[PDB]
């Protein structure tokens, strides 16, 4: 299936690049998956003094049965990278809510290794409770700043990502956990470490 809307003005696609820093004002290869529930513009915005890829999202009040149907699902296609000797993939993730008081966001990471059926998903989903936010200190520009880490030795289905396993695509999903989130999201410094 494909989720479609009228043409949208994204920032320039650029070329797939890791670490993804967005400092060339391009998306560095990041784009919505064709199945992403969010298809609105991906632009490059300042976040916490650095250029970051960004989008707006307000989850539906009526929650879909499939937990990813309404989710931003952003993908770096055909990067064809490998983890090397890195234990983690990590990135800076920022929120600027206009509304956030209940439920949570569940952030998942997956890859598409051609040697592993084109899907390998990190086991360590990261949950951010929206009630935690009002107590968290914001950045100078009013964002909540997370640095999200995924242990690449914890992958579902007994699949193992070796140092040399080709990862054709990288996917990040920010799923709605029965939440009332509305506002802007941003990613930066997507990298292995
Ligand atoms: O845990 C957080 C959250 O989970 C929600 O449920 C998720 C579940 O966690 C996911 O595992 C599951 O993921 C599936 C994806 O939705 C689906 O798009 C992906 O499809 C892949 C397929 O696996 C892969 O084999 C296929 O490879 C093709 C290549 O891309 C082509 O290039 C090549 O030519 O052909 C191959 C073979 O077709 O690509 C497709 C597309 O990428 O499969 C995933 C695993 O099944 O999604 C669930 C949501 O639907 C849950 O809902 C939340 O409650 C929970 O918090
Ligand atoms: Ca940046």
């Amino acid at each position: 299936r494909a989720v479609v809307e009228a043409p949208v003005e994204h920032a320039p696609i650029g070329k797939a690049t890791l670490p993804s820093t967005f400092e060339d004002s391009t998306r560095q290869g990041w784009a919505w998956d064709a199945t992403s529930g969010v298809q609105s513009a991906l632009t490059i915005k300042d976040a916490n003094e650095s250029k970051a890829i960004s989008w707006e999202v307000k989850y539906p009040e009526v929650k879909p049965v499939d937990g990813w149907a309404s989710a931003p699902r952003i993908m770096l296609g055909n990067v064809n990278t490998t983890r090397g000797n890195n234990k983690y993939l990590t990135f800076d993730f920022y929120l600027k809510p206009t509304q956030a008081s209940k439920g949570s966001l569940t952030i998942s990471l997956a890859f598409a290794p051609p040697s592993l059926g084109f899907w390998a998903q990190a086991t360590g989903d990261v949950n951010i409770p929206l009630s935690s936010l009002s107590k968290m200190k914001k950045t100078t520009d009013g964002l909540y700043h997370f640095q999200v880490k995924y242990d690449l030795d914890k992958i579902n289905d007994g699949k193992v990502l070796t140092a040399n396993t080709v990862l054709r695509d990288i996917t990040i999903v920010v799923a709605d956990g029965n939440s009332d989130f509305a506002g802007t999201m941003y990613l930066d410094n997507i990298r292995f470490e």
Side-chain angles (χ1 to χ4, degrees):
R1 86 189 186 264
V3 181
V4 295
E5 57 177 88
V8 346
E9 207 170 297
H10 303 295
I13 185 57
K15 282 283 97 217
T17 303
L18 286 170
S20 307
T21 65
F22 311 102
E23 293 303 317
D24 62 10
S25 297
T26 75
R27 293 180 281 141
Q28 294 188 329
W30 290 91
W32 294 125
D33 194 78
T35 71
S36 183
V38 173
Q39 292 286 336
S40 57
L42 284 162
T43 60
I44 305 311
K45 288 183 164 161
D46 292 342
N48 190 38
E49 336 165 314
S50 188
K51 289 179 187 284
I53 190 160
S54 180
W55 63 93
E56 291 289 323
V57 55
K58 179 165 65 175
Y59 293 114
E61 286 170 283
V62 180
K63 316 284 186 197
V65 187
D66 182 285
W68 279 5
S70 63
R73 174 174 165 168
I74 198 179
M75 180 174 66
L76 182 66
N78 290 340
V79 67
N80 293 125
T81 195
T82 61
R83 68 185 283 197
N85 51 226
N86 294 107
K87 179 82 171 165
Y88 290 96
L89 182 143
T90 190
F91 45 87
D92 291 301
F93 175 66
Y94 302 86
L95 301 174
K96 192 177 199 176
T98 58
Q99 177 64 31
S101 78
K102 62 182 160 184
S104 63
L105 305 178
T106 298
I107 312 173
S108 297
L109 174 77
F111 299 94
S115 72
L116 297 166
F118 304 88
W119 198 255
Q121 185 165 319
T123 299
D125 292 334
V126 181
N127 188 258
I128 297 172
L130 293 193
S131 73
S132 74
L133 287 185
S134 71
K135 300 170 108 191
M136 183 179 183
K137 183 176 172 69
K138 298 182 214 181
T139 60
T140 61
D141 59 333
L143 308 181
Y144 297 101
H145 181 188
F146 297 89
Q147 178 197 339
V148 187
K149 302 184 77 177
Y150 291 90
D151 177 353
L152 302 173
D153 289 324
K154 292 179 177 179
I155 304 296
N156 287 345
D157 296 343
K159 288 177 171 175
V160 172
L161 302 185
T162 75
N164 293 323
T165 293
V166 173
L167 313 172
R168 184 192 73 196
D169 309 329
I170 300 177
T171 293
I172 292 167
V173 178
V174 182
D176 185 14
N178 290 99
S179 93
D180 65 345
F181 186 87
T184 310
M185 295 189 176
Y186 317 66
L187 286 165
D188 199 3
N189 302 124
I190 305 167
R191 58 200 187 280
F192 290 106
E193 69 160 26

